[PDB]
Design a protein around this ligand. Structure first.
Ligand SMILES: CCCCCCCCCCCCCCCCCC(=O)OC[C@H](CO[C@@H]1O[C@H](CO[C@H]2O[C@H](CO)[C@H](O)[C@H](O)[C@H]2O)[C@H](O)[C@H](O)[C@H]1O)OC(=O)CCCCCCCCCCCCCCCCC
Ligand SMILES: CCCCCCCCCCCCCCCCCC(=O)OC[C@H](CO[C@@H]1O[C@H](CO[C@H]2O[C@H](CO)[C@H](O)[C@H](O)[C@H]2O)[C@H](O)[C@H](O)[C@H]1O)OC(=O)CCCCCCCCCCCCCCCCC
Ligand code: CLA
Ligand code: CLA
Ligand code: CLA
Ligand SMILES: CCCCCCCCCCCCCCCCCC(=O)OC[C@H](CO[C@@H]1O[C@H](CO)[C@H](O)[C@H](O)[C@H]1O)OC(=O)CCCCCCCCCCCCCCCCC
Ligand SMILES: CCCCCCCCCCCCCCCCCC(=O)OC[C@H](CO[C@@H]1O[C@H](CO)[C@H](O)[C@H](O)[C@H]1O)OC(=O)CCCCCCCCCCCCCCCCC
Ligand SMILES: CCCCCCCCCCCCCCCC(=O)OC[C@H](COP(=O)(O)OC[C@@H](O)CO)OC(=O)CCCCCCCCCCCCCCC
Ligand SMILES: CC1=C(/C=C/C(C)=C/C=C/C(C)=C/C=C/C=C(C)/C=C/C=C(C)/C=C/C2=C(C)CCCC2(C)C)C(C)(C)CCC1
Ligand SMILES: CC1=C(/C=C/C(C)=C/C=C/C(C)=C/C=C/C=C(C)/C=C/C=C(C)/C=C/C2=C(C)CCCC2(C)C)C(C)(C)CCC1
Ligand SMILES: CC1=C(/C=C/C(C)=C/C=C/C(C)=C/C=C/C=C(C)/C=C/C=C(C)/C=C/C2=C(C)CCCC2(C)C)C(C)(C)CCC1
Ligand code: OEX
Ligand SMILES: [Fe+2]
Lengths: 341, 136, 451, 52, 35, 37, 334
């Protein structure tokens, strides 16, 4: 009837890719985060920001290429193309590291626009919105690492660059400087990721091994029409199996599939709380009862004090080349070496 | 950006400087990694780390070893660091090249390019050559 | 088209060679075609390994794996691991290449024109999987060949040229095995050792007299057991324990071939007798001892008493004492104190490394060997740059031991998975429930209350 | 003495009489049912359901 | 220490022999299909 | 390298170990042309 | 009638509370001895010479540790690969000093887990199930045998084996990074994709079932009580969740087949952990990951740094500091 109704009926039309209202936020912003990454890893260097090479023009393969974080002198500037740093020039915008905030900002509005996509399709199909709530897990890892972690730090420079090996140094930068593995929020996150991979490997292998005979063929994939009301696997058998192997087992398909949602997602929320606590440098660095004892008793050694000496090697050896803006000129005689290494 | 001023290396004990043609610096790298680079990788010596390929360490040898003519001298007749006795029996050489099968086929220009690589590499990388793992 | 779609058989295209279980001509043509590929690779790889051979670099620096098996047989090898000729390596790679064109033609004949079942026309070759007299005959015929193939090693090492002994007195050279060891307390001594350190179950055969003397007993067993399974029939206990079907025999092999898969992958890491260090490069244990021996020679020239040289931990910096009492090398190399190598065994005694022989008799070929085995340690990378994991990109070396111990070991786990898949199906195909649970008769419902 | 090359780790003679009386004490249990059966009765199955 | 050692080889080849003579005990026939 | 009567065929021999991989891909090409039936 | 047949009938009975089976004849004695020694060695066990340099590393709770730092320490560098039982130790005090209980726990663990795996087969045979849950459990058995068995073999000592603890795990992972460069190795890459993908398709499948549940309850009671146990009606509209994901990405990327869907959940992690556990195995024999250090150069020949060179300087920090007293010679061959 009205003008709003014609636009509402056009976006929600059955077509190849469902656009909806949320596609106006997703499809422009996701296309430019992805294309900003493919351009930045191919053409744009890191020679002026980090003093590296992170492009395909500079000989890096898929692994050692990245879209890199800007300089520490930029601080937390948004680095707009028209801004006071770039001033409209495209070429000087790329050399300062403007594509990285271009990827991260238009990417953050892609994950907004993709989670709104999951509320919109669920309302048209008419289902409960648990996909949009389980996808809030990965939103809490993007925001609290690519956005909330460099905000608490000195600049955008201490953020993960969007490249394969550039994530890998961020894994190593976070052990030596922060002792991230000791943090109980990672420990509750590893329990959800390795716990979530566990549940789909079991539920994958128990459904597929309690199937009913619905055909004479040896292939069991053929014997399932999608609109049938009979269940395709014996729940009573699978309960009787695991009650004797493992001792305790699900007797509820509604509780089972909810539990496959809770376990992976909670590991992304609990691990997201800790990385917000490392923006503020509130790290779980030391057990002081272990540290006061190892200072007074020069014979008491645990595995825990062995990890601190591994972190002095990370804090001293890479920090010269890690942070060229700070100009660490270490002598050879201050770098902690071991015996004969 | 391999300028001929950068390719110009010292050639004799007096101090004359000649330039290396661009096939000398290319064969000089392939031959060095294939022959010498098993132990002398990046200027350090694996089996005796005191005696390196540093331009400081080549100069302090009792015959001065920085020259191209002095390095090819060492290859055909390797004395020690103080130059009193020969270690041709244990270092690969031309004189003791029946034991080492790796040096039975080397010409004069091939040692001229290997010694070119040992001399021209501290001019390219100033501190990485023989600086150990600190300067990797 | 009948027999070659899912409507006739019940197997999809991806599990398509499972249609060959109950046809015998198509199955025979498949096993002789894959045998045509095993041959064809080995002929074409050696020709590839000959055309890239350079006499300057050693045999292991050039990254070959197949022309070093023939050098252990003794073709074209000189004294001290120096490959001389490389005309006989060309000859072997052609015979294993021409012959695959014949085995290729059997795979394309028997599987595209041969009868589907041999049991109709050819009653000698035709069979059934459920038959137990025929299957032990097929096992028996193909065991007497593995007996005869073991004597070809013994004939070649005693009569036809000899084999390469790295322990040969005077240096490693092609040596006729004159007097092999035929003692079953010694030969089956290996088979019942511990697999752990120091004993090292079957890897630790340390001379060619036990190798060639051992392949005699293999030829004795595989012929008597070949004749045993031709004549006889499986006993009462053997008929009750097995599943006599087609896929069950396949999952019996896949368990045993994985045993051979791990063991050949552990020969290549530790053994320096069947795999000479002159050919395959130094072992994992050997390059750890060659480092400590090199700096032993280095600081002995500085007038340092190396026996009384107190280490930084309080142990021996150079010579210390093993937990069984022997004089060994010190460092992280104290774990590899069982390293028995032809360049360190001149310095042994009853007690271990003889200190009098270290102070006086170190020969310069041992210094040329320990410096060669330090710089060519088996530590590499996938892009084939050597050294430690933090080495810069200048050398191009990964040891051929690390390619064999990481690829046959790689396969030997997946063939253990093949024992798990193919025997889970074959035990359940014998029982009837491999297609799923019957809806009319569920076995769990006719059981006790659950508790 | 750890790294001795002795069969099954049998160091002393007394450990043999342990091994022989372990396999045989259950073997004799096993022969009480599956022993003394007909060793000449076949089947053309994949699996036998003969008797207890 | 040679008294403990005797006790272990009893316990190992007790349960290993129950394993070996378990599957020799007509073990394929113990299925819910028949017998 | 190869003997002197065979140095001519040094390019062809370099391709030859790859050829067993090409039989694995020949099965799928044959399954595509048969229409996966 | 016989005593053995009345014992085989009990040990293979599915009417037991827990199925014992013939693999339980060597699962239960193995894992209860790995357990009962672990609880004692984690709580009360004296310090252990791990580096073989007679510097004993404390690992138990009574010697001033916690849950995080306490760990069953691996055996000595002095022992190395040698089999070290209690009777080959001349006292228990000599056994506990040299890293005794690490070999007693690990060897009774790997036998009990490889018997727990075969036990999952056996009950699937006696219940009429298709058999292959135990093939999915091969993937953590591959990974447990990679860090406790295969990596001590190729490195030649159980001292390089993984410490049974929490802080000992991260001593294991970091030292494995410096010496082998696991992150650049494509098999750790193929299993990070296995568990990121595994936790994706877990929470992606578990959401689309819970989204499309059928009304069987009221708003006061729980959602889960609309499933009665053992019912034969399907508890969710699978056509609904297919039409949702058929619009969320596009139409042809959606499994309408629930059997092929529930197979892909078992394929992706298990293949990802088979491949990963053969990354530790091929890096046990020092076939390390990629090494792109000093790979990008200018025309002058000066080394231009990359991200791998920054990653290298993190590896050089751990390499020069791990086992800071155990080394005497310039190259960590072990
Ligand atoms: C949930 C779902 C979210 C959905 C995703 C939405 C994504 C949208 C993207 C958000 C855009 C945020 C980036 C804005 C830039 C930024 O932050 O820019 C940062 C600036 C602050 O600027 C910084 O300010 C600092 C303070 O300096 C001051 O103090 C100094 C010493 O006192 C000197 O005196 C200096 O002269 C003086 O200016 C330093 O100067 C830094 O160099 C300068 O960069 O603030 C600002 O723009 C705004 C900051 C105030 C707003 C606070 C909210 C945002 C910050 C949250 C994090 C708080 C930190 C907690 C860590 C956890
Ligand atoms: C079983 C499956 C279930 C897993 C449970 C594991 C617990 C089972 C009980 C423990 C058995 C452990 C096996 C020990 C293997 C080992 O230490 O093996 C090492 C020995 C090699 O022995 C070495 O042998 C060497 C022999 O060398 C000597 O002799 C040579 C002679 O040339 C050289 O001279 C050399 O220099 C000299 O030192 C030394 O003696 C070493 O000390 C000694 O360790 O290999 C050999 O036994 C041969 C190879 C055996 C196969 C190994 C397979 C590994 C299994 C991994 C499976 C992963 C999948 C699990 C799925 C489930
Ligand atoms: C080791 C590799 C190998 C081998 C030897 C075989 C062999 C066979 N497969 Mg098979 N297969 C394989 C891998 C292999 N497969 C793989 C990996 C898959 C999964 C994609 C399949 C899927 C598959 C299906 C789905 C089916 C088979 C079938 C068959 C059999 C008959 C084929 C036939 O009659 O069709 C005719 C074949 C052709 C027309 C192919 C022509 C290609 C020619 C032979 C290539 C020759 C090239 C060579 C260089 C020439 C050398 C000549 C010599 C003179 C030098 C045959 C025994 C069929 C079967 O079960 O039969 C009952 C069947 O249904 N296969
Ligand atoms: C293990 C492999 C194997 C097996 C079991 C068979 C079996 C069979 N083939 Mg076949 N074949 C094979 C390989 C094999 N073939 C190969 C490799 C080729 C290519 C050359 C052929 C080419 C071929 C043709 C062209 C024909 C057969 C035929 C037959 C059938 C009758 C053969 C006959 O008359 O027997 C009696 C035959 C003999 C006694 C002659 C034996 C002579 C050989 C050279 C002795 C072998 C020497 C030695 C054992 C091998 C050592 C090498 C080894 C280490 C690899 C029979 C089922 C025929 C058939 O089915 O009829 C339609 C038929 O026409 N085959
Ligand atoms: C490729 C190798 C191969 C394969 C697959 C087979 C396959 C088979 N053999 Mg065979 N065999 C082979 C080589 C092979 N054989 C060789 C080379 C020999 C000569 C030594 C034998 C000697 C042989 C005999 C004597 C018997 C078999 C039997 C069997 C059947 C399975 C039994 C089994 O595996 O128990 C595995 C069992 C063990 C590894 C341990 C068994 C321990 C025995 C029973 C203790 C009793 C002492 C006994 C007299 C042997 C003394 C040695 C020592 C143990 C004291 C099966 C058909 C049995 C059969 O049914 O005969 C037809 C049988 O009785 N085989
Ligand atoms: C029809 C529509 C098609 C839709 C296309 C959608 C766009 C998405 C495509 C994403 C591709 C991202 C991968 C980039 C890889 C790249 O180009 O490397 C290209 C690089 C370039 O190669 C490098 O070139 C340099 C030039 O100086 C140097 O020579 C380096 O040595 C050389 O490696 O190649 C590699 O690094 C080699 C390995 C490539 C490995 C790529 C696969 C890795 C796994 C990623 C899989 C992504 C899945 C995509 C699925 C779609
Ligand atoms: C495939 C995966 C890899 C498979 C393993 C590969 C085989 C490894 C080699 C095995 C060696 C076998 C040699 C005999 C055993 C040996 O000597 O050990 C004997 C060794 C030697 O034992 C030690 O020996 C020393 C002498 O140097 C000292 O004397 C010590 O006191 C003594 O304990 O002890 C052990 O290793 C005991 C192993 C106990 C494991 C038994 C569990 C097996 C149960 C499996 C079920 C049986 C079914 C399989 C049988 C069919
Ligand atoms: C030798 C081998 C013998 C088996 C060994 C036994 C060990 C088994 C462990 C018991 C799990 C008990 C947890 C109760 C849990 C409980 O009772 O749940 C009971 C629950 C049954 O749910 P139903 O379907 O009955 O629920 C329907 C509705 O009523 C939901 O409320 O079963 C499961 O879902 C458990 C599956 C996950 C199992 C979680 C196990 C996590 C591992 C343990 C973590 C702790 C280890 C800490 C050590 C420091
Ligand atoms: C930045 C920017 C921009 C732009 C944007 C865009 C427009 C972009 C796009 C772009 C794009 C969008 C890109 C793409 C790329 C792609 C690529 C380059 C791909 C590649 C691929 C590959 C290489 C892969 C591979 C493979 C294959 C082929 C098959 C098999 C598998 C694999 C995976 C291996 C603008 C203007 C706004 C401005 C601002 C800034
Ligand atoms: C059945 C079937 C199949 C299979 C196939 C196959 C497996 C085959 C094989 C094939 C084969 C296995 C082949 C072979 C061939 C070979 C040949 C044909 C050779 C020849 C040779 C020559 C020609 C040489 C020459 C020379 C000389 C003489 C001297 C030196 C140089 C040269 C080397 C050049 C498939 C998968 C498709 C599937 C379907 C069915
Ligand atoms: C050449 C040589 C030699 C020799 C060799 C020998 C003489 C061998 C032997 C071998 C043998 C003598 C082996 C054995 C093996 C055995 C086995 C590995 C067994 C297995 C068994 C089974 C598998 C069973 C199973 C079962 C059960 C447990 C229960 C019931 C069921 C059934 C029956 C299935 C020597 C050392 C001098 C050195 C180097 C060279
Ligand atoms: O033990 Mn445990 O960590 Ca395997 O690397 Mn060599 O060893 Mn000793 O150092 Mn580094
Ligand atoms: Fe499900």
């Amino acid at each position: 009837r009205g003008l709003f109704d014609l636009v509402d009926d056009w976006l929600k039309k059955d077509r190849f890719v469902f656009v909806g209202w949320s596609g106006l936020l997703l499809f422009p912003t996701a296309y430019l985060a992805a294309g900003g990454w493919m351009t930045g890893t191919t053409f744009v260097t890191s020679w002026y920001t980090h003093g590296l090479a992170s492009s395909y023009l500079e000989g890096c393969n898929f692994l050692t290429a990245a879209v890199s974080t800007p300089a520490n002198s930029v601080g937390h500037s948004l680095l707009l193309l028209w801004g006071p740093e770039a001033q409209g020039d495209f070429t000087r915008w790329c050399q300062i590291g403007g594509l990285w905030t271009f990827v991260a900002l238009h990417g953050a509005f892609g994950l907004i626009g993709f989670c709104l996509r999951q509320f919109e399709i669920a309302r048209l199909v008419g289902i409960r919105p648990y996909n949009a709530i389980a996808f809030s897990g990965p939103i809490a890892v993007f925001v609290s690492v690519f956005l909330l972690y460099p905000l608490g730090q000195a600049s955008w420079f201490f953020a993960p660059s969007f490249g394969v090996a550039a994530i890998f140094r961020f894994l190593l930068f976070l052990q030596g400087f922060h002792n991230w593995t000791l943090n109980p929020f990672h420990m509750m996150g590893v329990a959800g990721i390795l716990g979530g991979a566990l549940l789909c490997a079991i539920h994958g292998a128990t459904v597929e091994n309690t199937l009913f005979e619905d055909g004479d063929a040896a292939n069991t994939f053929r014997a399932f029409t999608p609109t049938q009301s009979e269940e395709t696997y014996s729940m009573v058998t699978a309960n009787r199996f695991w009650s004797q192997i493992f001792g305790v087992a699900f007797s509820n398909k509604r509780w089972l599939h909810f539990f496959m949602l809770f376990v992976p997602v909670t590991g992304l929320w609990t691990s997201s709380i800790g990385i917000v606590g490392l923006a503020l440098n509130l790290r779980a660095y030391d057990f002081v009862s272990q540290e006061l004892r190892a200072a007074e008793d020069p014979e008491f050694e645990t595995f825990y004090t062995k990890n601190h000496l591994l972190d002095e090697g990370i804090r001293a050896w890479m920090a010269a080349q890690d942070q060229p803006h700070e100009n660490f000129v270490f002598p050879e005689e201050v770098l902690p070496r071991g015996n004969a290494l | 950006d391999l300028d001929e001023a950068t390719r110009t290396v010292v050639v004799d004990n007096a101090g004359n400087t000649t330039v290396l043609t661009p096939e000398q610096v290319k064969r000089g790298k392939r031959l060095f990694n294939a022959t010498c680079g098993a132990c002398h990788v990046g200027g350090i010596t694996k089996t005796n780390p005191n005696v390196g390929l540093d331009p400081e360490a080549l100069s302090l040898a009792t015959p001065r070893r920085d020259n191209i003519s002095a390095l090819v001298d060492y290859i055909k007749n390797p004395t020690t660091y103080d130059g009193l006795e020969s270690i041709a029996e244990v270092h690969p050489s031309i004189k003791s090249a029946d034991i080492y099968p790796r040096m039975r086929s080397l010409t004069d220009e091939d040692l001229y390019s290997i010694a070119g690589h040992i001399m021209l590499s501290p001019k390219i990388a100033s501190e990485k050559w023989g600086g150990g793992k600190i300067y990797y | 088209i009948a027999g070659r779609d899912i409507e006739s058989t019940g197997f999809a295209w991806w599990s398509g060679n499972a249609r060959l279980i109950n046809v015998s001509g198509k199955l025979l043509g498949a096993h002789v075609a894959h045998a045509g590929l095993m041959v064809f690779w080995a002929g074409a790889m050696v020709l590839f390994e000959v055309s890239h051979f350079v006499p300057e670099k050693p045999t292991y620096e050039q990254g070959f794996i197949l022309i070093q098996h023939l050098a252990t047989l003794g073709y074209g090898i000189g004294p001290g691991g120096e490959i001389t000729s490389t005309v006989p390596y060309f000859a072997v790679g052609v015979i294993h290449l021409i012959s695959s064109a014949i085995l290729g033609f059997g795979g394309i004949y028997h599987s595209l024109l041969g009868p589907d079942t041999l049991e109709e026309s050819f009653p000698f070759f035709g069979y059934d999987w459920r038959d137990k007299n025929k299957m032990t005959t097929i096992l028996g015929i193909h065991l007497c060949l593995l007996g005869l193939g073991s004597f070809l090693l013994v004939i070649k090492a005693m009569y036809l040229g000899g084999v390469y002994d790295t322990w040969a007195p005077g240096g490693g050279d092609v040596r006729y095995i004159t007097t092999p060891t035929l003692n079953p307390i010694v030969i089956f001594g290996y088979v019942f050792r511990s697999p752990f350190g120091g004993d090292g179950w079957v890897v630790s055969v340390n001379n060619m007299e036990d190798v060639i003397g051992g392949h005699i007993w293999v030829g004795i067993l595989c012929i008597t057991g070949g004749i045993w399974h031709i004549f006889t029939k499986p006993f009462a206990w053997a008929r009750r324990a097995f599943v006599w079907s087609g896929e069950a025999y396949l999952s019996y092999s896949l368990a045993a071939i994985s045993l051979m898969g791990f063991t050949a992958a552990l020969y290549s890491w530790y053994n320096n007798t069947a795999y000479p260090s002159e050919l395959y490069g130094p072992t994992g244990p050997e390059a750890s001892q060659a480092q400590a021996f090199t700096f032993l020679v280095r600081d002995q020239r500085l007038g340092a008493n190396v026996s009384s040289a107190q280490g930084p931990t309080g142990l021996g910096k150079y010579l210390m004492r093993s937990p069984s009492g022997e004089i060994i090398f010190g460092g992280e190399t104290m774990r590899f104190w069982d390293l028995r190598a032809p360049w360190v065994e001149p310095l042994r005694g009853p007690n271990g490394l003889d200190i009098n022989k270290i102070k006086n008799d170190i020969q310069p070929w041992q210094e040329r060997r320990a410096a060669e085995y330090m710089t060519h340690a088996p530590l590499g990378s996938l892009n084939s740059v050597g050294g430690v994991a933090t080495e810069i990109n200048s050398v191009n070396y990964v040891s051929p031991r690390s390619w064999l111990c990481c690829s046959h070991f790689f396969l030997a786990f997946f063939f253990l998975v093949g024992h798990w898949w193919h025997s889970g199906r074959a035990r359940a195909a014998a029982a009837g429930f491999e297609k799923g649970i019957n809806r009319a008769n569920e076995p769990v419902l006719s059981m006790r209350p659950i508790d | 003495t750890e790294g001795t090359n002795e069969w099954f780790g049998v160091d002393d003679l007394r450990l043999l009489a342990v091994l022989f009386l372990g396999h045989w004490a259950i073997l004799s249990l096993w022969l009480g049912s599956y022993g003394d059966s007909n060793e000449d009765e076949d089947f053309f199955g994949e699996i036998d359901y003969s008797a207890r | 220490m040679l008294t403990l050692k005797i006790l272990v080889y009893t316990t190992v080849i007790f349960f290993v022999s129950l394993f070996i003579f378990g599957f020799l005990s007509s073990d394929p026939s113990r299925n819910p299909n028949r017998k | 390298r190869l003997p002197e009567a065979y140095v001519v065929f040094s390019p062809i021999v370099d391709v030859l170990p790859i050829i067993p991989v090409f039989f694995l891909l020949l099965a799928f090409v044959w399954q595509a042309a048969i229409g996966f039936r | 009638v016989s005593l053995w047949e009345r014992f085989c009938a009990w040990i293979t009975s599915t009417e037991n509370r827990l199925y014992i089976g013939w693999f339980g004849c060597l699962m239960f004695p193995t894992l209860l001895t790995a357990t009962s020694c672990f609880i004692i060695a984690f709580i009360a066990a004296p310090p252990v010479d791990i580096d073989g340099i007679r510097e004993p590393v404390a690992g138990s709770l009574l010697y001033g540790n916690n849950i995080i730092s306490g760990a069953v320490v691996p055996s000595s560098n002095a022992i190395g690969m040698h089999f070290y039982p209690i009777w080959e130790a001349a006292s228990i005090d000599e056994w506990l000093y040299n890293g005794g209980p690490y070999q007693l726990i690990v060897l009774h663990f790997l036998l009990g887990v490889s018997a727990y795996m075969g036990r999952e087969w056996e009950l699937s045979y006696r219940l009429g199930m298709r058999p292959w849950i135990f093939v999915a459990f091969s993937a953590p058995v591959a990974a447990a045998s990679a860090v406790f068995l295969v990596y001590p073999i190729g490195q030649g000592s159980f001292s390089d084996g993984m410490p049974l603890g929490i802080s000992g795990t991260f001593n294991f992972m970091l030292v494995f990074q410096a010496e082998h460069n696991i992150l650049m190795h494509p098999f750790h890459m193929a299993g990070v994709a296995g568990v990121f993908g595994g936790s994706l398709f877990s929470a992606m499948h578990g959401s689309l079932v819970t989204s499309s549940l059928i009304r069987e309850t009221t708003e006061n009671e729980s959602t889960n009580y609309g499933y009665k146990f053992g019912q034969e009606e399907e508890t969710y509209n699978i056509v609904a969740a297919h039409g949702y994901f058929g619009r969320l990405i596009f139409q042809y990327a959606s499994f309408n087949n629930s059997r092929a869907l529930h197979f892909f959940l078992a394929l992706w992690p298990v293949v990802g952990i088979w491949i990963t556990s053969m990354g530790i195995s091929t890096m046990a024999f020092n076939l390390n990951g990629f090494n792109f250090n000093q790979s990008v150069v200018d025309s002058q020949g000066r080394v231009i740094n990359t991200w791998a060179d920054i990653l290298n300087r993190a590896n050089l920090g751990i390499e020069v500091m791990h086992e800071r007293n155990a080394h005497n010679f310039p190259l960590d061959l072990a």
